[PDB]
Amino acid sequence: PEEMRKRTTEMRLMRELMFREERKARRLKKIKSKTYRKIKKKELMKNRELAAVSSDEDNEDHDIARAKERMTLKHKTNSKWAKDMIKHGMTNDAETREEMEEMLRQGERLKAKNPWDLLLTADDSTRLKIVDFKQQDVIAEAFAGLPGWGEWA
Amino acid sequence: AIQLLQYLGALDNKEMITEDGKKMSLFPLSPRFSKMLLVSDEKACLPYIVAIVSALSVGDPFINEFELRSKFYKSRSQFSKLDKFSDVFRLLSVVSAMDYVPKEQKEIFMKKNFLRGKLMEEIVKLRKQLMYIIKSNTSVVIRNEDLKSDIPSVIQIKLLKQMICAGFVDHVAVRADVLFPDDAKITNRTSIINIPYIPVLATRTPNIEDCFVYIHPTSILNNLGEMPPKYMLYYSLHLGGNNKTRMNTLCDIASTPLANIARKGLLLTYSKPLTGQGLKTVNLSPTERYCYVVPRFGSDLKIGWDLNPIAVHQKKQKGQWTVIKFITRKGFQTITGEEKE
Amino acid sequence: VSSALFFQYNQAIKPPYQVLIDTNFINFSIQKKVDIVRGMMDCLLAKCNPLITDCVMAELEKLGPKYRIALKLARDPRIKRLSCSHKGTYADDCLVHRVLQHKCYIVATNDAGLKQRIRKIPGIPLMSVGGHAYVIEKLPDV
Amino acid sequence: TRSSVLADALNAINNAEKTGKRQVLIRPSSKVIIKFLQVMQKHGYIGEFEYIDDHRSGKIVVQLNGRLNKCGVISPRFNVKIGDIEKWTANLLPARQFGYVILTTSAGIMDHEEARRKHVSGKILGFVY
RNA sequence: UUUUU
RNA sequence: GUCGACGUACUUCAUAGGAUCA
Ligand SMILES: [Zn+2]
């Protein structure tokens, strides 16, 4: 049947669609600029926070997270990278100091302990079906005052 | 005026009266009030909107502080119980409460609550008349206990707010710090009455401070004690004695409901699909996709702003991506898994 | 003021010593391959009766499979169990409440915040693990 | 190139326990591998295992039961005296009776305590705990 | 200030 | 010669961050 041709078309659309994302994903992978990634991360966080995509952490989730942090102390300057930066006057620079900071605050966050949404469907189905013209329009009158796709058109 | 009727859906883009427009003309009310009735029948919310609409139609029965202290606030404390961010619901509380007052004690109640006794009478009379046209044109003898109605449910409270936004879609204002944090620096010491707001479709001036709007003294939000809501509906603007534009609050609206209400209007535009972790374009078909977008509310000479991202169902109709439906976060997450399996 | 304290000297804590184990202490013992019982006997040259409370134990059970080693070491029969009579499952608050109540315990921990808050309390020997073995801070008998 | 079959086998077992796999395939087999697994099995860290013959070095299939915390090989196989055995136990084991240190001594492959009981010593094969 | 089906 | 390169020895500049309060 000719329905087989339709199946070929939609598969073709899928494959090329994958190709476009592949090329776009490839190009982004090559760009490894610190600032470029830094801009992208901030924007992503803003959208996720704005959309509230991330579920709230119950008291249990906080307790387990705090337990692990206290258990390891992974977010203090005794870590390798922090110690190496500190001991060699590398953190005098602002940018590395921010990164060391950004680590530290994240650890601190984990350490913290008469009687007097359902979106409305305002389509016509939910309107009160109220019930009550041309001759009145005669009175207003009484006032006075795809073609050519394949052929020549 | 033609724009206003267009925003409310009365007129199409050709200035031609819509089926909604013809229905509004059957009411004696302003176009704004008629539209709220066009959305009020859902979940037996009709008496509440009638009470609100009648109260707004006849004017405020409340006596203001300037026109006149302890007995003043206890009365208001009673009628602001339904919601802490809704002046309109203060009107509803009074009107509905009046229905349960015996005829003999009514005059005592109105005086005791600093209520303009007459205006209440027209509201009840107008509440009866609107009740009559509705039942007469939907199917009529109306008796006084028909006006008696019980407290709205929390769901109904949410529906009523959006319902009102339909009649006041064009009168949404956003806190200035959200749009221009540099220009609008809010501190914890800042009085609520002095928190700037910006209305939608306000003419962009060289100085954005010129577009700032501030809350009325009469509003409960001055006594709220915490930060006001992000978005606010207003009825009218008044010029304060200090040359400060002053707004009469109606009620607050959340971001996602606002987008839904503006969707059927011309206020809402959709950005391109977002990308990143969590947010990804699930492609059902060459003509179908599910994705997150950033709705923009408002109409580069007017002040519009972007709303919270929302999951939407998009279809490629005539080569353009058209939003069919909104989707909850759970539904979108389930969709993503359904594609993976 | 506790009668067991002479100015800043605690004249009650004598051998054999009673020592409270903090959760983080166990790992730093494990990271350094320091046996808990012998490690303390070595630092203090005394018999030490290790004590582990419910809250710290509850913390340990919460940790998960990754810290199973600490857990079984925690359940060693030589380790005595302390009952907790307070709702909160936090460990740091529980420990300091105990040392405040009675002045006989050594606190074994490496958490800087808890160490600082113990340091404020007088007459509380503070013990830690660093380098290669345990170290005792405020204990004159050494 | 492949230097130590024992290290390969132990790493495969450890990863199989990482992923929760109840059973693991080891290639190639050897006598030392079998003896090491027999010690592990006597101490109960691993369950049954199978030797599959292919007229070559062969294969092994070990059942894994979730009581193995870690297994490793000490390469090079240092010579160990009875004086130095306690040093190795202190270095390679978290505690004094957490696991065993396996030695290939002149009387065979066995854990450290058995070597002490027999009063023997030799080269060090690895550790299990 | 007014004011309307 | 107030010379160049290198070696050696020293000096110096880049440290504040979050919360609350006025
Ligand atoms: Zn406790």
From Swiss-Prot, chain A:
Domain of life: Eukaryota
Modified residues (Phosphoserine): S54, S55
Compartments reported by the entry: Nucleus, Nucleolus
Leader sequence residues: none
Additional note from the record: Present with 1470 molecules/cell in log phase SD medium.
Summary of the function given for this chain in its UniProt record: Involved in nucleolar processing of pre-18S ribosomal RNA.
Entry similarity comment: Belongs to the UTP14 family.
Subunit record text: Interacts with snoRNA U3. Interacts with MPP10. Component of the ribosomal small subunit (SSU) processome composed of at least 40 protein subunits and snoRNA U3.
Protein name (Swiss-Prot/TrEMBL): U3 small nucleolar RNA-associated protein 14
Organism annotation: Saccharomyces cerevisiae (strain ATCC 204508 / S288c)
From Swiss-Prot, chain B:
Subcellular location: Nucleus, Nucleolus
Superkingdom field: Eukaryota
Primary role: Probable ATP-binding RNA helicase. Required for 18S rRNA synthesis. May play a role in restructuring of the pre-rRNA.
Family: Belongs to the DEAD box helicase family. DEAH subfamily.
Extra facts: Present with 2000 molecules/cell in log phase SD medium.
Subunit structure: Interacts with snoRNA U3. Component of the ribosomal small subunit (SSU) processome composed of at least 40 protein subunits and snoRNA U3.
Protein name (Swiss-Prot/TrEMBL): Probable ATP-dependent RNA helicase DHR1
Phylogenetic placement of the source organism: Eukaryota, Fungi, Dikarya, Ascomycota, Saccharomycotina
Originating gene: ECM16
Residues of the full protein shown: 879 to 1265 of 1267
Curated annotation (Swiss-Prot), chain C:
Top-level taxonomic group: Eukaryota
Keywords on record: Nucleus, Ribosome biogenesis, rRNA processing
GO molecular function, one term: RNA endonuclease activity
Cellular location(s): Nucleus, Nucleolus
GO BP, sorted A to Z: endonucleolytic cleavage in 5'-ETS of tricistronic rRNA transcript (SSU-rRNA, 5.8S rRNA, LSU-rRNA); endonucleolytic cleavage in ITS1 to separate SSU-rRNA from 5.8S rRNA and LSU-rRNA from tricistronic rRNA transcript (SSU-rRNA, 5.8S rRNA, LSU-rRNA); endonucleolytic cleavage to generate mature 5'-end of SSU-rRNA from (SSU-rRNA, 5.8S rRNA, LSU-rRNA); maturation of SSU-rRNA
Residues of the PINc domain: 17-116
GO terms under cellular component: nucleolus; nucleoplasm; small-subunit processome
Family: Belongs to the UTP23/FCF1 family. FCF1 subfamily.
Record function comment: Essential protein involved in pre-rRNA processing and 40S ribosomal subunit assembly. Required for the early cleavage steps of 35S rRNA at the A(0), A(1), and A(2) sites.
UniProt subunit comment: Interacts with FAF1.
Name used for this protein in its record: rRNA-processing protein FCF1
Gene designation per UniProt: FCF1
Full-length numbering of the shown residues: 47 to 188 of 189
Swiss-Prot record, chain D:
Miscellaneous field: Present with 40400 molecules/cell in log phase SD medium. There are 2 genes for uS8 in yeast.
Its biological purpose: Component of the ribosome, a large ribonucleoprotein complex responsible for the synthesis of proteins in the cell. The small ribosomal subunit (SSU) binds messenger RNAs (mRNAs) and translates the encoded message by selecting cognate aminoacyl-transfer RNA (tRNA) molecules. The large subunit (LSU) contains the ribosomal catalytic site termed the peptidyl transferase center (PTC), which catalyzes the formation of peptide bonds, thereby polymerizing the amino acids delivered by tRNAs into a polypeptide chain.
Descriptive protein name: Small ribosomal subunit protein uS8A
Organism placement in taxonomy: Eukaryota, Fungi, Dikarya, Ascomycota, Saccharomycotina
Primary location recorded for the protein, binned into one broad class: cytoplasm
PROSITE patterns: RIBOSOMAL_S8 (PS00053)
Protein source organism: Saccharomyces cerevisiae (strain ATCC 204508 / S288c) (Baker's yeast)
Entry GO CC: cytosol; cytosolic small ribosomal subunit
Family, per entry: Belongs to the universal ribosomal protein uS8 family.
